[PDB]
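Might you be able to consider the sequence and fold that I enclose below?
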Amino acid sequence: SVKETKLYDLLGVSPSANEQELKKGYRKAALKYHPDKPTGDTEKFKEISEAFEILNDPQKREIYDQYGLEAARSGGPSFGP
């Protein structure tokens, strides 16, 4: 199932969407916060870029859904060297 929706909410796309459709969500958000647009916002652009990359990798997306952002960023729920 889908626990955290933070990254999906940043992109503005349903978590039922696949990596291809999630990319489309990023593309839309990227334009929204595009540096070269009046509504450009580096901070928000970074956030959605993190959401994209994490949700782009099928492995990290799975980890995100199952465990959450913390694990997704680490690349696993476990920690160590």
Remarks:
- Residues 1-81 form one domain.
- The chain has five helices and no strands.
